[PDB]
Symmetry: D3
Subunit: 260 residues, 6 copies
């Protein structure tokens, strides 16, 4: 549609990548109500589209996302935050079945780090910094700033970042485990598009099952996790792309997956 | 009070930091019954004091804490261990609501690493060493040596340190995620005091809520943890420090928190 | 027995190490039915033997283990996979009480990386490459390739390796937390044997209790994990090796453990 | 709206009860796609309405709900069920924050028992019957037929009902713990409306908090459950209805809750 | 000590039972600060005494306990309730290692039921009534009134009692699974004393281990619970009372336990 | 084989039921090493047999199972319990995929109640009695006596039965939730055989999936439990018996399941 806060387009080879660029160079990409609504609409459109296989979330060259609009949730009370239409649609990023890649090429503070951690793959540049400055305004994160950051990085560094609001570099985030690959600030979008193409080049149902299996590592135990993994591996024998890949590996050729 | 094994003082800017220094060079700060009792008393005093906002735990320059006194628990039986009189007061460090910073200097083996991991922020010196020598004396850790270490560092290195007792440097601990920042041995206490001042400069109730949110990552699942984080973020709207910080951020000024 | 796919021998000082070398330089150590059966038999023999205190798993110089045999599981169906003897005896590696050291040399794809992660200690060389290329053929990991890899390395890198199948180096594995030490390829087996000797030089029952305590960090919560750790520490006072080691530490001598 | 399968109306004194009656006597209230869509729309309408405080789900005088439409999902496959929009909008009943009362006045088999157990209060008539006949058609429950039934009734009776499909009376369901009250078939709707009025006469936010606290008993542990309960009890001191109720209890008068 | 709100005494055969009677008829045994302090002191005294093997909690003939004092927590704010000064010493009843028997007589509303649910054995009278009247004043339970009640009784009846504040009889409580034995109100104290004597006649350490094993059924999964139960059963062989009872069963004589 | 302690036979219509009768009247069916070994062998044989679809466990007319042999584990120490020679093959009853029915007649104390609760369906006679008399000999249950009994019956009654060893009748067990249905002592075997026939008359793979779904209610949460249930329901569409039954239901005929 005519999105004013974001720009959703079809990039990549053969138009198989859904690029959502936060276009707002006036408030460091403040996650307001309209921006979040447009982001959710674009995510739903890319999920319902059969051509888009992967989604790539990218911000500006100076700030990825500074979080929610502090100038909007200021005059809010306990009732208007516990039962209202404010700050409710924040879990739509984790409900999609297709993989989402977060390309952080700048400042990612508050809600930005949360949206980055809610994705599957986190690509950051050299001039990218992550922090939790909520403690600077007498508030705490509310979208996984203390849950995913602790389980992915650690207890000590997460405690420090939450209680002090200190900014960490991309090298420290890669050494800890926050991000997976450091790319230049000019070719970060290109590497994200290439990764999305490599992901979308496989069977969509198998990719979704693998994503669910990986996400089950933070909601279940090790024994039950392995049991569910075995169950999904056994259920994967009901598709046609599996036998196609097996025959391609046996005959030493390329597997032509048909998403079935 | 007149503590003989430890020294509890009030340091930092405006006397807002509680410094507990282990004074026992003849035994590498052996965690005996009297030392643990004095530590618990100092923690309770710093928790009941409204001026102290953060606590800093520091040992000696040659060794932080060599663990429990093996010479005292030598002539013990199975019946004497379930009798709640010998080794029960060990979880009080995890019962305090104010953040505790561990300044590790020198040898930190057994109980030292456990007390360091039970804190929120772990600061180690350039010559700091962590290990679990319990397997060298026919015992096993009992204060998080096999629970927090495995979740913070990993499975392989924790298994190696538990089954072999090998020592690790501060660089390896930072690479694996045990510590968050490496400071010199001569300026570690200063950095810990500065971090405590940066923590004690914000709202105490918000800091406690953030600490609880971070600690809820090892006891709950991802969805339940996110829901509890949302509930706490909504409850933060009932305090005045949140509104004060938001107004200060909007007006571009310094937020004056009153811990309310 | 007359193993046709592996070589099980007794190495180390006083024959206290059980070395299982995958002898199959024709399919990159393809984990077929016979190879897995022989591996399980060797593990059971080393577990029943009182002299072997630790087991060392090692593959080939070019590749540790390519994974399950694709040519065998090609013409299989859902009903045929669910209720049969196809891919069922894969959890025996996690049922043994003695520590198992994984010496990975070369490629570790699919079943290889899973079997390496199911062990306690993971040792790799400079020319080591871990990956999970199940998505390239239309399948997913099914033996802990998405559960242990996510909890030990991280969410982002695990998602990337599962959805793309990229090759990671041993340095990145040590930085993330997959492997513990990086030894030369020509001396990795010697280092693994030395580690197995250092592990088997202690009390076997205490080593098993410590292994169970460390494994309980992924199956239980933090509070219940600490409770079970305290219970096991209290139960360790019923053996003679504990008192022997304590008396040796007090008298400053060597502890002569008797595995009792 | 103009519904063709259900009837959603406002019953009770002062129009505070939302009555949803399944109007389909020709198929025993078969849960088809249109019926589920209309039910979700009615639930959303009653949730967004500020006057309706409680919802009452009621079926027919002979059959409450005979499960999903078997004739519609007959010619379906694995891909048609997994990667499509077939049998997906079934958790919305668990997403509403207002209490929902299930009035079973007849046959509740398959999806009917699942929808009844997904509600908060279950009222069954004298002729009400509960069973799991999926095993009679080669399928299994998929909306809590094996999760909530086992935790609310017991392992033995749930196993029996799932593996045999045998029906149970209202007396056995009340004795086991499936239902709370047994009312005649002529006054069941009246008792349901009275219970909804008794629920919709208090503070809506406190009712939602209590509902979340009760629902958290099947998602977390006992210690973390009690911690979350304490946190919610502390957060309840931020509303105006609590102080009004306390003042009314002290002054021995009636509390005029304003839902704030 | 000279308790004013409660009466703690040593009843039973050979003074092996600790009886705590709530003496407050003018307020239906309102759980105020002084009453809770005296109860905690009596519990500590009975726990430190080696002769008392079991504790029996009993209230008045007209009402067991009407809960906390609403007149004291009326003019309280969020900051006052969140601080560790009001409503904090409520988990001590769950911290004792000796079994506690709850004798319920008359009205048991709010905490009077919550404390009753925090005990091991719940003995109710013929004129006993359990309810949760928190929604009538605008509050919610906070001491395990929505966690244990839901797991023990059920989801539907707990939801009804929380959202409506309805009173249930002792027969309905036993049918649902709240209490274990119904005794007359004139001889309930005698039956409780007899049960405490039957409990305090066995090995105290084995009784404590069994209590921990039973309490560990709501904190972790079934497999981990069974493994911890096996570990505790294996550790029980390190005592002398186990072998004494086994020899007494073999030699057909009475087992003379020595609490060791 | 020539089983001396038990008797395994093929009963039921068309020999589709596996009946294992405990033959040991001189010791009240003491669960010794040989008896447990024969039971495990019979269970494995009935699991590998394609004709048997359900297993029925039945004891004697005067006593079902009086637990493990106390006269055999008397002269055992702490070191003899952590080995792999005594009391290890007790979890084989929960590893089978086919349903197991427990016909309880007479006294079922200690291991008998544990083996009964480890089954899916528990059928008890009019004279059946359940108790946990381990506390009478200074021991504790170790095979689910404090884990499954607490979750299936409740906390209070389980605590009472564990700390006092009191016996309960079949009526109290059915009222609490321990047993499913009560049958006469002379026709209990016939009802068990009829239930096994009704269970085996369906698709074996679907029955196994349903059993796994029901067993998952004690190992995972409600959300992940429902997710796994949905996944298994989606995977059920990959079988032929599913479509056969869904077609026979529409055609109003008998579904001829082919176990595929
Ligand atoms: C469920 C909801 C999620 C829960 C978690 C949260 O609480 S989310 C909210 C938490 N987020 C944060 O705390 C981040 C706060 N942001 C900052 O502190 C700082 O902006 C910064 C560290 C990023 C550095 O900023 P700069 O040094 O570039 O300078 P400046 O602040 O003036 O940025 C330019 C413009 O961005 C605006 N701006 C920046 N962040 C903003 C935000 N989170 N909300 C609204 N507006 C913001 C400034 O007001 C300013 O507006 P003008 O153009 O008028 O000058
Ligand atoms: C809840 C309970 C948690 C679990 C409880 C535990 O298991 S804790 C116990 C676990 N074990 C440990 O932590 C390791 C024991 N500690 C060590 O071995 C040391 O730390 C070390 C490795 C640096 C070796 O020491 P050094 O090379 O500096 O030389 P030395 O051994 O003589 O140490 C100096 C002095 O400290 C004493 N000392 C060292 N560790 C001690 C300890 N844990 N308890 C008491 N005393 C100790 C020595 O006896 C000696 O005193 P004198 O020479 O004057 O006689
Ligand atoms: C419960 C079980 C868990 C479920 C999860 C899984 O395990 S699912 C499956 C896991 N993933 C895999 O198995 C894929 C593994 N792929 C590889 O190992 C390969 O190394 C590679 C494709 C990356 C290419 O490297 P190379 O060129 O060095 O190896 P290449 O395959 O071309 O040829 C050398 C020999 O390797 C053997 N080889 C490699 N993988 C094999 C396999 N899975 N089964 C049999 N043989 C295999 C071939 O026999 C081949 O000989 P010839 O070709 O001459 O005959
Ligand atoms: C995510 C998905 C969750 C839900 C998935 C599930 O749980 S699976 C769906 C669960 N349902 C089942 O397993 C079986 C459901 N069947 C019943 O409930 C029925 O009460 C019964 C057959 C057992 C008993 O019914 P009666 O004997 O009283 O009467 P009768 O035999 O004529 O019932 C058939 C009539 O009702 C309709 N009918 C009944 N159940 C139906 C169903 N599940 N789907 C479609 N139609 C159904 C038929 O169209 C038919 O109408 P006509 O006369 O026009 O032909
Ligand atoms: C973490 C903290 C714990 C969590 C739980 C809570 O805190 S929530 C608090 C839980 N408790 C409750 O919600 C309400 C408890 N009980 C009731 O409402 C009862 O049903 C009832 C008042 C209707 C009983 O009616 P009766 O006819 O028996 O007696 P009557 O109506 O004449 O007056 C009540 C008398 O008992 C006392 N009384 C009753 N409940 C009381 C209470 N919660 N706190 C203090 N006192 C109470 C009054 O002193 C009063 O005496 P006077 O007439 O002299 O004044
Ligand atoms: C996971 C590993 C184990 C888990 C934990 C456990 O289960 S430990 C086991 C739990 N402990 C128990 O169940 C207690 C055993 N229960 C009983 O013995 C009986 O049921 C009873 C005393 C309660 C009531 O029985 P009766 O009065 O009808 O008959 P009697 O008193 O003669 O029972 C003893 C006779 O049965 C035999 N007998 C009965 N139970 C036995 C047992 N568990 N071990 C060995 N022998 C047993 C004796 O050899 C003896 O036969 P003789 O005439 O030759 O002398
Ligand atoms: Mg790491
Ligand atoms: Mg019940």
């Amino acid at each position: 549609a005519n999105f004013e806060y974001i720009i959703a387009e079809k990039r990549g080879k053969n138009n198989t990548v859904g690029l959502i660029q936060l276009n707002r160079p006036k408030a460091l990409n403040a996650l307001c109500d309209g921006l979040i609504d447009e982001l959710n609409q674009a995510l739903k459109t890319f999920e319902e589209d059969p051509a888009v296989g992967a989604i790539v979330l990218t911000g500006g060259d100076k700030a990825f996302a500074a979080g929610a609009d502090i100038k909007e949730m200021q005059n809010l009370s306990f009732q208007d935050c516990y039962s209202s239409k404010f700050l409710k649609h924040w879990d739509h990023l984790t409900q999609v079945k297709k993989p989402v890649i977060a390309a952080v090429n700048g400042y990612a503070f508050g809600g930005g780090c949360e949206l980055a951690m809610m994705c599957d793959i986190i690509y950051a540049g050299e001039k990218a910094q992550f922090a939790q400055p909520e403690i600077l305004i007498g508030t705490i994160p509310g979208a996984g700033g203390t849950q995913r950051l602790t389980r992915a990085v650690g207890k000590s560094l997460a405690m420090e970042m939450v209680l002090t609001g200190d900014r960490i570099s991309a090298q420290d985030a890669k050494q800890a485990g926050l991000v997976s690959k450091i790319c230049p600030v000019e070719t970060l979008v290109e590497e994200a598009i290439q990764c999305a193409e490599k992901i979308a080049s496989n069977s969509k149902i198998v990719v979704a099952m693998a994503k669910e299996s990986v996400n089950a590592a933070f909601e279940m135990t090790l024994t039950e996790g392995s049991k569910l993994e075995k169950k999904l591996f056994y259920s994967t024998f009901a598709t046609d792309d599996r036998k196609e890949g097996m025959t391609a590996f046996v005959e030493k050729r390329k597997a032509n997956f048909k998403d079935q």
